[PDB]
Amino acid sequence: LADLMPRVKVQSVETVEGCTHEVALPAEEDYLPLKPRVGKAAKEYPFILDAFQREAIQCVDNNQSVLVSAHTSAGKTVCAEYAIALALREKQRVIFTSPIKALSNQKYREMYEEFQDVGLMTGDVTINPTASCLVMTTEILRSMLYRGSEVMREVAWVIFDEIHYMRDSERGVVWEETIILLPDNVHYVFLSATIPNARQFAEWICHLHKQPCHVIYTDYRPTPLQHYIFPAGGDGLHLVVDENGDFREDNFNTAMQVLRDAGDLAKKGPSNVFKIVKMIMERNFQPVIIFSFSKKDCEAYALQMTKLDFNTDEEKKMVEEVFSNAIDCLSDEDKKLPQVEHVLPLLKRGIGIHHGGLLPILKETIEILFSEGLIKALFATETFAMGINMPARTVLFTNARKFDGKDFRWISSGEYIQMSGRAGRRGMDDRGIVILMVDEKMSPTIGKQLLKGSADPLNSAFHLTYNMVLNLLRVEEINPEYMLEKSFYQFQHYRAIPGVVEKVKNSEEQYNKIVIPNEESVVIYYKIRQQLAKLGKEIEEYIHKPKYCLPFLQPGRLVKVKNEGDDFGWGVVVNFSKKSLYVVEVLLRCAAKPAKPDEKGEMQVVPVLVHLLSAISSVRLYIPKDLRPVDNRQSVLKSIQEVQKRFPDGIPLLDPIDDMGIQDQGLKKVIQKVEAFEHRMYSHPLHNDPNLETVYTLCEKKAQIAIDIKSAKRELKKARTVLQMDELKCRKRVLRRLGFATSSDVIEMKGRVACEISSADELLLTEMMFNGLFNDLSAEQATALLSCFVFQENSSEMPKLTEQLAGPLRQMQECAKRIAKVSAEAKLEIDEETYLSSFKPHLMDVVYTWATGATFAHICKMTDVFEGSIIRCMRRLEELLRQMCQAAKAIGNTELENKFAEGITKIKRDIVFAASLYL
């Protein structure tokens, strides 16, 4: 067949205790150990490098891609810096790509102060494009690879900070899509955390770019952690994991027992979080991060602490100075905002908050005050853990459960690893501490798997998108089929083919060797007996039914017993009773095993389950009263030997219908097939042959080898299958019907328009644009309408909308229905009501009034949505508008380009687009 499957081996390089080194290679190539670096290093560091860093360095010295899998704060960034150093030293280019903008900004600050030849590129900012070392968001990098080749001109290295972003669903597809698009001549540095399938990843990179890829892994943690649990309604903390990483079941069970009886029915005041952060300051555990999955809970817990003060008057003066300096850029009108007033009292008292709801300038100001130690008790959301390493001495969890779908579920070990990794500062702490608050009973096994358990594997979330398909039809070198065959998602489901195909040939060889049966008629005999055996077992099941056989288990009844293959011939029952199922005590020929053919045998009474009886006879031979003696047991064996003689035709069996009473209709058709197949058996020319058993065993062997080939090919045809082709055929069908591309998969002008839209539903917007919906709108309502396309995170009640805004909305929803009907007409899994309601219009009025010139203060009164979520949306809208301009420019539609351009200016002003403090 045409099996174009992966063919990659992996070898283990020897290294010093402290790290493990594997390298994934193409199988054809011969492994070659890294040779020592030649010449001075590319970068020296102000510390002694750890073993895992040296090995990764040696990879980059040898111009070979490497994946570094170490815990956060272990020193992964050291490796990337050496790559940047080496490429700059060699007058080559570098791209340090990060998944999030905010991280890209901070990394740019790092890279700039260190190398100075660096630039930045995100959806919001573009600094020094000609830099030799570009920090850029992954979204930007894929957009450049689809656009042109100058993105990678003279680029020798690409650094992927935190590959975990691939697990994400909203932006993990762009990550994987990017790696598939890079040229093979490029070398990669991947930075990750402890993942159990790091090898699988390197194997993919190796199968993908036909180049060796290394794996450096280390569980080294520069600061050991002590994990504590706090039972709800409990007075203090139980050490559940010590610094050595051992799980103390001693203190875990005693913690949950306090939890078991703590709640009402099992048996004002302050808060439990309050009491935990209080003892934290009294035990010198500060600074601490208190993670809360609800921004509303995050602000409450932080406000409870306003009663206390965690800062010295010196630190106060520092906080106030750092705060007033970071705000000076804001306009007088914006300094009076209520959020600016409400937070400064908490910062003065050493309390801080961090969540997506804050304003960007404040969120970053708090990040700065935290790195300065002026914030000793920070209540932050989960997002704060998915960012640059800003560690604390202590991490506190307010809740252990998170809402996902339509049911509650604990937090995964992967999430606990992520957030707890911030406890423990490199040189500042002898040991970071982690505190977990539980309110629901927790099994010990899951507690061990959660605190000490490895991180969840790194599995691809790759899926298809119209924006991806269209861009792949635009390039005349690649096709969407290629993108799927070369994805990590497909590589992981291609992972069973290696072992399967090798076994099929070896078996196919072993099958042709045992292919020595004298004649082909033998197979017919074999299949006949095989059927009789299947029928035989079916009859037994009816006789197993205790409702049918128990009445005939009188002492002395002859019974044949078989279990899992081996049998004990015949035997006599003595009595029966229940077990724990029923059990009968039966003499048999032999926890013992049956007697062999050459052995004369020795009778022994043993209890056996009733569902182990193959046949039951009509005969009841007489047994001695006291069966304890051995001589009596032999006497029974001789009595049955005489019964077998009185019936050479076979010991008579009970008619299951005439005698046992099984009136079931299925047993009728089974007994008919038995008599018919028994007639076929004795008719077969081979039945009489004395060599039958010699040829029936070679036939049984050749038959089993064939069974393996069948099941092996079965899973191989599954593993070899591409799973997402049906979706692709349906999505191409949608693009055909709507005119984005032709039946021959050639991009139409309409498709090139959609290509420019990546931050939203390209398909709906291009349809809206081509239908002339925007043509009648003003720039202020045009931009307000687009707000529905960048407000994915919506969970509030709608507002009262003016007719000037509902008009285009109703018009837009009409095109949305048409998009759904055609998708369904293509047999795509889509719910029409779900599609229309996905575009939340909640900020139509807010965006519209900001477009007209209203102050930020004025628009906040309009909606209860947290004020930071408004700015996050406006930033996405401005980025989307910029795309819309590129879309209209693709067809030269300058009148629409001028309208979106106008929308940009109307919203790009004041604090919404305040320059980041890190830039």
Partner: peptide, 18 residues
């Protein structure tokens, strides 16, 4: 010797033994 029995046994299921 040996004998052949194709008939089963029974229990009242309502009896009170003692």
């Amino acid at each position: 010797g040996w004998f052949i029995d194709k008939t089963p046994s029974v229990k009242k299921d309502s009896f009170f033994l003692d």
